[PDB]
């Protein structure tokens with residue numbers, strides 16, 4: 463493969479590493495051939511959780527069809543589809559080494575991911591990735607994201623200063639973040655990590671949300687506000703650029719995005 | 731601390747992340763206040779190995795005096811000084827939480843670090859850093875380097891193409907690297923990692939060197955050639971820039987170096 467170029471920046475228009483030395487994953491920062499080898503040598507298995515409750519079962523067909531074309535191709539994958547309507551889950555044909563399980567349901571997502579992430583039947587699974595369903599894959603989402611703990615830059619806020627971030631601002635909430643604190647604003651629609659780090663994150667967020675509930679407060683952006691509090695205090699080991707959570711109808715195709723990899727499906 | 735700036739590159743003149751997403755550590759890529767907190771929360775202890783055999787015991791006084799001013803200040807440190815002359819080890823006054831042990835000696839370094847890294851008295855030690863003694867610290871060398879496995883870009887080769895790297899080129903040597911392979915040329919004077927990853931690296935290099943010896947071959951740059959073979963196949967999780975291993979008499983103070991942190995002491 464090509465030799466890296468010590469004296470040539472991978473990017474001149476964006477930040478590619480956080481101040482705590484976690485890579486920020488953009489196109490042009492990684493050679494997927496090297497990463498795919500490293501992760502295949504460990505026979506890595508990726509679990510993907512996705513919730514499709516009530517009308518949102520309609521989003522599953524395109525979500526799964528496009529995941530098969532773009533998500534972790536060549537690696538072992540297990541989809542876990544959480545739904546109140548198991549018969550509505552479309553029968554999509556999967557590539558080899560890929561499986562799908564339907565978990566009937568029934569704070570919902572963090573509580574349910576926490577309970578599920580503690581089950582022994584995940585012994586085989588190495589990483590969990592937790593995403594919204596009202597989305598489609600348009601380009602590669604692969605093992606470059608995998609790491610002990612990651613969050614994703616929210617596509618509306620990546621250029622914002624921290625006072626503009628919509629963190630929970632009331633001190634009476636467990637999700638509270640002061641106006642002079644905060645590294646980034648992370649989207650609740652795409653986070654993940656090793657099974658252990660996802661257990662810890664979802665347990666912390668669910669236990670925080672139960673405290674707030676006992677106290678009669680609901681954080682401003684619900685589990686996303688608790689996710690931001692958690693990732694402020696437990697800094698992620700990679701941060702995904704907005705390539706990985708984009709809304710093209712809202713935000714177009716800016717010059718800093720070389721690829722739109724996982725994008726919102728327009729809805730009401 | 732200051733908010734990171736998503737739309738401003740940490741560096742426009744150099745590569746700050748490798749193609750396998752390991753940070754390349756330069757000045758301006760890290761906020762040491764954040765890292766120091768993360769590592770103090772784990773009560774991290776760093777061991778430093780250094781060999782001073784025959785005339786090279788003369789380099790210990792400045793090496794230790796300057797390590798006390800610049801190496802891992804505020805963290806727990808244990809120096810392990812390997813020498814054939816324990817009485818020649820200078821009695822340098824250490825800061826709090828820092829200790830020094832003298833190990834009398836007697837392939838020497840990788841064999842001796844391998845044996846030593848397997849001893850139970852390292853139970854307390856979290857990372858090992860392995861350096862040459864003919865050096866002095868001139869500026870901060872701290873927990874920004876710590877990671878499971880690191881190597882350091884050799885200051886003569888960081889701008890070179892891989893065919894110019896002085897890898898072992900004879901296929902009959904265990905250190906052999908083909909002309910079209912290689913990411914960087916690493917210096918044998920500064921590598922390290924977690925205790926486990928240093929055990930693995932020094933065992934592999936020592937076992938490789940014993941194979942070559944049985945076969946009547948000595949690799950071109952001895953343990954440095956085996957270190958490069960190892961780090962080609964087991965890629966480091968951080969790479970230190972030449973800030974961390976510099977020769978100012980040879981190479982001056984180029985524009986791409988913002989700090990000269992650990993530098994060669996001129997010798998015969």
Ligand SMILES: CCCCCCO[C@@H]1O[C@H](CO)[C@H](O)[C@H](O)[C@H]1O[C@@H]1O[C@@H](C)[C@@H](O)[C@@H](O)[C@@H]1O
Pocket residue numbers: 616617618628649650683686708709712726
């Ligand atoms: C017409 C909607 C414009 C909203 C832009 C800001 O996005 C929203 O940001 C809040 C936090 O301030 C939440 O993260 C919320 O989930 C975001 O909205 C969703 O994501 C954006 C990118 C867009 O796809 C919206 O349609 C979604 O509802």
Ligand SMILES: CCCCCCO[C@@H]1O[C@H](CO)[C@H](O)[C@H](O)[C@H]1O[C@@H]1O[C@@H](C)[C@@H](O)[C@@H](O)[C@@H]1O
Pocket residue numbers: 884885886896917918951954976977980994
């Ligand atoms: C006058 C010496 C010029 C040598 C420059 C190249 O450095 C040497 O590189 C070889 C591999 O090609 C080895 O890594 C060797 O240890 C290097 O020499 C040492 O390091 C350089 C930076 C300089 O300090 C020399 O005086 C050292 O002997």
Ligand SMILES: O=c1ccn([C@@H]2O[C@H](COP(=O)(O)OP(=O)(O)O)[C@@H](O)[C@H]2O)c(=O)[nH]1
Pocket residue numbers: 512513514515516517518519593594595596651
């Ligand atoms: O009626 C609903 C509402 C939400 N969701 C799940 O919760 C996620 C977040 O909601 P939305 O996607 O409604 O939030 P935005 O992403 O517009 O905040 C959805 O992607 C689904 O995975 C669902 O399954 N049914």
Ligand SMILES: O=c1ccn([C@@H]2O[C@H](COP(=O)(O)OP(=O)(O)O)[C@@H](O)[C@H]2O)c(=O)[nH]1
Pocket residue numbers: 780781782783784785786787861862863864919
């Ligand atoms: O006579 C010697 C030769 C080498 N060394 C150790 O081996 C390292 C590498 O040798 P040098 O530093 O001689 O190599 P260059 O760094 O010039 O290759 C030295 O820093 C010492 O730590 C030593 O202790 N005594």
Ligand SMILES: [Mn+2]
Pocket residue numbers: 594595596651
């Ligand atoms: Mn959504």
Ligand SMILES: [Mn+2]
Pocket residue numbers: 862863864919
């Ligand atoms: Mn030396």
